[PDB]
Structure formats: C-alpha cells, structure tokens
Design a protein around this motif. Structure first.
Motif, short mmCIF file in Angstrom:
data_model
loop_
_atom_site.label_atom_id
_atom_site.label_comp_id
_atom_site.label_asym_id
_atom_site.label_seq_id
_atom_site.Cartn_x
_atom_site.Cartn_y
_atom_site.Cartn_z
N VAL A 34 0.76 -1.23 0.00
CA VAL A 34 0.00 0.00 0.00
C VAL A 34 0.81 1.31 0.00
CG1 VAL A 34 -2.01 -1.02 1.09
CG2 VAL A 34 -0.18 -0.05 2.53
N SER A 35 2.13 1.23 0.13
CA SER A 35 2.90 2.46 0.20
C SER A 35 3.57 2.81 -1.12
CB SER A 35 3.97 2.36 1.28
OG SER A 35 3.39 1.79 2.45
N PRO A 36 3.37 4.05 -1.56
CA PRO A 36 3.98 4.59 -2.79
C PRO A 36 5.51 4.45 -2.81
CG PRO A 36 2.26 6.03 -2.00
CD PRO A 36 2.51 5.04 -0.89
N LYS A 37 6.13 4.34 -1.64
CA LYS A 37 7.57 4.17 -1.56
C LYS A 37 7.97 2.76 -1.98
CE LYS A 37 11.29 3.98 1.98
NZ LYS A 37 11.69 4.35 3.39
N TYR A 38 7.05 1.81 -1.88
CA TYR A 38 7.37 0.43 -2.22
C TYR A 38 6.58 -0.02 -3.45
CZ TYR A 38 10.01 0.35 2.11
OH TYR A 38 10.89 0.62 3.11
N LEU A 39 5.46 -0.72 -3.28
CA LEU A 39 4.71 -1.24 -4.43
C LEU A 39 3.43 -0.51 -4.73
CD1 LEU A 39 4.88 -5.00 -3.38
CD2 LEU A 39 6.45 -3.82 -4.97
N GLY A 40 3.09 0.43 -3.87
CA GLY A 40 1.81 1.13 -3.95
C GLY A 40 1.44 1.78 -5.27
N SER A 41 2.41 2.41 -5.93
CA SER A 41 2.11 3.10 -7.17
C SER A 41 1.78 2.13 -8.31
CB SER A 41 3.26 4.06 -7.57
OG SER A 41 4.35 3.33 -8.10
N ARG A 42 2.10 0.84 -8.15
CA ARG A 42 1.77 -0.13 -9.18
C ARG A 42 0.64 -1.09 -8.79
NH1 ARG A 42 7.57 -0.94 -8.09
NH2 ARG A 42 7.65 -3.23 -8.24
N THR A 43 0.05 -0.88 -7.62
CA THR A 43 -0.97 -1.81 -7.13
C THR A 43 -2.33 -1.21 -7.31
OG1 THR A 43 0.59 -2.63 -5.45
CG2 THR A 43 -1.61 -3.27 -5.13
N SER A 44 -3.30 -2.02 -7.72
CA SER A 44 -4.66 -1.51 -7.88
C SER A 44 -5.25 -1.01 -6.57
CB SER A 44 -5.60 -2.57 -8.48
OG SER A 44 -5.88 -3.62 -7.56
N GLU A 45 -6.13 -0.02 -6.70
CA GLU A 45 -6.86 0.47 -5.56
C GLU A 45 -7.70 -0.65 -4.92
OE1 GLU A 45 -6.25 4.21 -3.88
OE2 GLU A 45 -5.53 3.34 -5.76
N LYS A 46 -8.15 -1.60 -5.71
CA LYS A 46 -8.96 -2.69 -5.15
C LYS A 46 -8.13 -3.43 -4.09
CE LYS A 46 -11.25 -5.41 -8.10
NZ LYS A 46 -10.97 -6.43 -9.15
N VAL A 47 -6.93 -3.84 -4.47
CA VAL A 47 -6.04 -4.57 -3.60
C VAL A 47 -5.63 -3.73 -2.42
CG1 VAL A 47 -3.66 -5.49 -3.43
CG2 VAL A 47 -5.20 -6.12 -5.37
N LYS A 48 -5.22 -2.50 -2.67
CA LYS A 48 -4.80 -1.63 -1.59
C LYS A 48 -5.91 -1.39 -0.58
CE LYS A 48 -2.98 1.64 -4.20
NZ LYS A 48 -2.15 2.72 -4.78
N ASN A 49 -7.10 -1.01 -1.03
CA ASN A 49 -8.20 -0.74 -0.10
C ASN A 49 -8.64 -1.96 0.68
OD1 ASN A 49 -9.47 2.11 -1.93
ND2 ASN A 49 -8.31 2.04 0.00
N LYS A 50 -8.51 -3.14 0.07
CA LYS A 50 -8.86 -4.38 0.76
C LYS A 50 -7.93 -4.58 1.93
CE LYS A 50 -10.00 -9.28 0.27
NZ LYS A 50 -11.46 -9.11 0.54
N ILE A 51 -6.64 -4.34 1.70
CA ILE A 51 -5.66 -4.42 2.78
C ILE A 51 -5.96 -3.41 3.90
CG2 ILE A 51 -3.23 -4.04 3.43
CD1 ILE A 51 -2.43 -5.26 0.71
N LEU A 52 -6.25 -2.16 3.56
CA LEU A 52 -6.49 -1.13 4.58
C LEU A 52 -7.73 -1.44 5.45
CD1 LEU A 52 -5.54 2.08 2.49
CD2 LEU A 52 -4.18 0.83 4.14
N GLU A 53 -8.77 -1.94 4.80
CA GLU A 53 -10.00 -2.32 5.51
C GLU A 53 -9.78 -3.56 6.36
OE1 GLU A 53 -12.94 -0.66 5.82
OE2 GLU A 53 -11.58 0.88 5.08
N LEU A 54 -8.96 -4.48 5.88
CA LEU A 54 -8.65 -5.67 6.68
C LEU A 54 -7.91 -5.25 7.94
CD1 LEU A 54 -7.63 -8.58 4.23
CD2 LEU A 54 -9.58 -8.42 5.82
#
Lengths: 140, 7
Positions: free
Chosen positions: A92-112
């Motif tokens: 989820v972090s732009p410093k690592y993989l965030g800029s290439r990860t879908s919002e679907k995946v990222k938001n699922k992680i944040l809600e989890l």
C-alpha cells in the motif's frame, strides 16, 4: 499431496473462475495442524499478496481474511508481527509497491487492517501499523 | 520480530 504450498497454490490460482472455498477453508484448517504451520502460512501469504497479478493477490487476501476470522492465537500472533505486517505495508505504500498496485487490492488491505484493530485489540502491532498508515496519509 | 517498516 496437500501441503500448505499446494493448498495456497490452489486457493489463489489465477485460473480460478471463482473463489475456491474448499481450498481456502482447507488452507485455514491445515495451518494450525502443525507447530510450524502459522509462520509458513504467513510467509506464503505475504508472497501471494504482493503478486502483480490482481486476482492472485485478491484471492490471497481472501484466504488471509478467512483465516484471521477464525480462532487461533498462533496464527493471529504471526499476522500480528511486523515481519508480516511489513509485507502488507509494502503493497500500500507509494515508496514500495503502492504506485503499481490496484486500488482494489490496496483498499482491501487497509479495511482488513482496520477490522483487525477492532476485532483483535490484543494484537497491538496491528494497531501501531495502522496508526502509522494514518499519520503517513495512506488511511484517508 | 523485525522493526516496523519505514515508508
């Protein structure tokens, strides 16, 4: 022969046309049937969740959600270490993989993560990780 | 355990 590796490969297979509940549940069941199960489970999960292939990541996150919803101090504690949380944070972090990860995946992680701060207050590092994410502006 | 990730 169904080891954790084979099970997770089946439960997160990119070719699955729909969630494979039998495999997902089987992975969660099998991971406590061994002392070393939980750490292996979590290392496998961390790698699948980081996949550039979305459906693979999404299925892996469903496995993780599913296993976490069930009782088990050892698994809960493994996921509750920075050793695992750091792998989710990279996604989820732009410093690592965030800029290439879908919002679907990222938001699922944040809600989890949020759900675990509410449902599993004893896992204090989960809450620490989530508070970092809010301060750093990930959690809006 | 590892240190919490720096982002």
């Amino acid at each position: 022969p169904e080891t954790l590796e084979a099970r997770i490969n089946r439960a997160t297979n990119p070719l699955n046309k729909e969630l494979d509940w039998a495999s997902i549940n089987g992975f969660c069941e099998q991971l406590n049937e061994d002392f070393e199960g939980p750490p292996l489970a979590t290392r496998l999960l961390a790698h699948k969740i980081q996949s550039p292939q979305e459906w693979e990541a999404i299925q892996a996150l469903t496995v993780l959600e599913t296993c976490m919803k069930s009782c088990g101090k050892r698994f809960h504690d493994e996921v509750g270490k920075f050793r695992f949380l750091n792998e989710l944070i990279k996604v989820v972090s732009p410093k690592y993989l965030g800029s290439r990860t879908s919002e679907k995946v990222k938001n699922k992680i944040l809600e989890l993560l949020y759900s675990w701060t509410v449902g599993l207050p004893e896992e204090v590092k989960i809450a620490e990780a989530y508070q970092m994410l809010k301060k750093q502006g990930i959690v809006k | 355990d590892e240190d919490l990730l720096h982002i």
